[PDB]
Every structure is written in structure tokens, then in C-alpha cells.
Design a protein around this ligand. Structure first.
Ligand SMILES: N=C(N)c1ccc(O)c(CN2CC[C@H](NS(=O)(=O)c3cc4ncccc4s3)C2=O)c1
Ligand SMILES: [Ca+2]
Length: 223
């Protein structure tokens, strides 16, 4: 996260860290046994880390659970990043409490102008690389579709939306991918991509979760 602030230990209880010997992507806990992340984050040998703040120190409240299976959307296209969504089933159910809780799926899509909270352990610099120890947060509004398509001509599908600041300086970045975009208590987006980080006229692009609620429910129901 570039231009954000320190969230505060366990203030984003649904935030998850995908680990394979190091942190590589974020995710959101949607129920005691399922995590939602980005398809481009897929890799074998994933360990889901819950209740984390400082990802480099065991401070208590952490729960490390191996992924039993990862389900990348069947129509995911790595070239365009369309349908950048993946479901992860935990080997065992997580222990829900105040520091570890699930986030609700949306019943309808969010409107432009809606303020959301984006979080993650990604790069905090728009120039070089600087990874934080603790979880970073950023409040950002959903942009209009025309503004989004104007910024990224020919690269925005109906399954994506822009969020952030056209003035640059505040954005999500590498390492934040797969993470949550929560608006009004509902998971509306997944950190997917952008051109560089926090650059002028190049906001972040996110997977439009409201377009996948039926797929998520049907997939979870049969697995
Ligand atoms: N600004 C952000 N919110 C953000 C978030 C996560 C990232 O990892 C990056 C860094 N990222 C991710 C890739 C992007 N590279 S690129 O501009 O060549 C593009 C490649 C590509 N492939 C398919 C569709 C569209 C494109 S744009 C970049 O800087 C940026
Ligand atoms: Ca820790």
C-alpha cells in the first residue's frame, strides 16, 4: 500500500496473508473454511495465515492453516487478467473470534463515489521497493467507469472497476494482490492490477466481486 496508514493490530479481521516461505499475496476470509483471493496469486504449497499484523513476528492471535485446494476461475485469462478471482479451501476450519472474522459478500454492486478500505502488506513505495512489517490501510473511492476506461483504454472489462486517486500518491501495489476492497461492510473488490503504483492518472484496478457472488456460492456449495 502506497500512501496509506498503519491499520492497527487486528483491526481488519478478515484480512489474510498467503505464505509460501514468505508473504506473496493477500486474501479475505468469507467463512470459517473459505478464503477469496486473486487468480494470478495461484501457486502450490500455500499456507493461509490468519489473525496477522506483523508478518515477521509471532505475537499471538495467529492461525496458520494449509490450503486443501485452490480453485482458480475457469475463465481466468492471464494475459488480460479478466476473471482474476480464486477460492481457497482451508484444510481445517479457522477459529473465529474478535481478531479473526469473515467478511460479507455483496448483494448488489457499489456505485461510483463509494468509499472503501483497501489493506495489505505490499510495497509502500511508488519508486523502489519497501515492504512493511505491519498491515497497511488505505481509504479510497470507487471511480466512474468512464474515468476508469479513459485511464486504461481497451483494458477494462465488465468484471473490473477502478478505485483510488487520479492525482497519484495513494494506491495498492505489488504484494497487495488478492487483498480486500471493503465498502459498507461488504467485500466489493479484490486487488488485481494497475500500471505501476500510485502514478498520476493510473488508478488501481480491482476484480468486481458482485459479478461473482453466484459463482462463489455455487462453487463453495459443491466443494
Ligand atoms: N497500481 C496498483 N493498484 C497495482 C497493484 C498490484 C500490482 O502488482 C501492481 C504492479 N503492476 C502489475 C502489472 C503492471 N504491469 S503492466 O503495466 O505492464 C500491465 C500488465 C497487464 N496484464 C494484464 C492486464 C493489464 C495489465 S497492465 C504493474 O505495474 C500495481
Ligand atoms: Ca505475526
Amino acid at each position: 500500500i502506497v500512501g496509506g496508514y498503519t491499520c492497527g493490530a487486528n483491526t481488519v479481521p478478515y484480512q489474510v496473508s498467503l505464505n509460501s516461505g514468505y508473504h506473496f499475496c493477500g486474501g479475505s476470509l468469507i467463512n470459517s473454511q473459505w478464503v477469496v483471493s486473486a487468480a494470478h496469486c495461484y501457486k502450490s504449497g500455500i499456507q493461509v495465515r490468519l489473525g496477522e499484523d506483523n508478518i515477521n513476528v509471532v505475537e499471538g492471535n495467529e492461525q496458520f492453516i494449509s490450503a486443501s485446494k485452490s480453485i482458480v476461475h475457469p475463465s481466468y485469462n492471464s494475459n488480460t487478467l479478466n476473471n482474476d478471482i480464486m477460492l481457497i479451501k482451508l484444510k481445517s476450519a479457522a477459529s473465529l473470534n474478535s481478531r479473526v472474522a469473515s467478511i460479507s459478500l455483496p448483494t448488489s454492486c457499489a456505485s461510483a463515489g463509494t468509499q472503501c478500505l483497501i489493506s495489505g502488506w505490499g510495497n509502500t513505495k511508488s519508486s523502489g521497493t519497501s515492504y512493511p512489517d505491519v498491515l497497511k490501510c488505505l481509504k479510497a473511492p470507487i471511480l466512474s467507469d468512464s474515468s476508469c476506461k479513459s485511464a486504461y483504454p481497451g483494458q477494462i472489462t465488465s468484471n473490473m472497476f477502478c478505485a483510488g486517486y487520479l492525482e497519484g500518491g495513494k494506491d495498492s501495489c505489488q504484494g497487495d494482490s488478492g487483498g480486500p476492497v471493503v465498502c459498507s461492510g461488504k467485500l466489493q473488490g479484490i486487488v488485481s492490477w494497475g500500471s505501476g503504483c500510485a502514478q498520476k492518472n493510473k488508478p488501481g484496478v480491482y476484480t468486481k466481486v458482485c459479478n461473482y457472488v453466484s459463482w462463489i456460492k455455487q462453487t463453495i456449495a459443491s466443494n
